[PDB]
Design a protein around this nucleic acid. Sequence first.
DNA 1: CAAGGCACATGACAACGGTGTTCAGTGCCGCGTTGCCCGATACCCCCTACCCGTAGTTGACTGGCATCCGGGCGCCGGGTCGCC
Length: 89
Amino acid sequence: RQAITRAMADQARTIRIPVHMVEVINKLARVQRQMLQDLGREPTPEELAKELDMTPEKVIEVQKYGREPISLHTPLGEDGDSEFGDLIE
DNA sequence: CAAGGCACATGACAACGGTGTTCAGTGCCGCGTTGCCCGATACCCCCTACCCGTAGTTGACTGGCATCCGGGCGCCGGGTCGCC
C-alpha cells in the first residue's frame, strides 16, 4: 500500500502535487464527503475549514490545487468535427 | 572819353559739429560647468515558518475489468486450413 500510494501521489496527476499536499487534499475531500453524507447538504466553507482545523484560505487554496486538466482534443459538442483546442486564442 | 582807385563776394582754404563707427577692454548679468551635501537604494547579514522528500506502520486479508453486436461497404491482401 505504501508503494502504491506513493506512486499514485507522485505520478497520477498531470500537474504534479507534493505528497503532503496530496494527503491534505485527499483528507479534506474524504472528510467533506463525510460532511455531505452526514448533513445531507453541501457544507459551507467555514464549517469545512474548522473541521479541517485550518483557516478558509487554505481550504480554498487546496480546493483549487486539487483539479485536473481538460483535454483540448475533445469534441466541442457544438459540432462533431470541432475540437476544443481550436477555439481558445 | 579812358585809366586808376575802392566796395562785397568769391574760389579756394581748415577746423569745428555732431554723430557714427572701432577694436578694446572690461565687465553685467544670464546660462552653465563643477565641488560638496544628503537621501535613497541595492545588498550583505542574522532569526524562524513552512514546503517537500524519506521512511516506517506487523491478527489475518492470494486473479480484474467490462467489454461487444442494428456502421457499411468495399476492397486488398494475407493467412489458413481443406483438397485430392
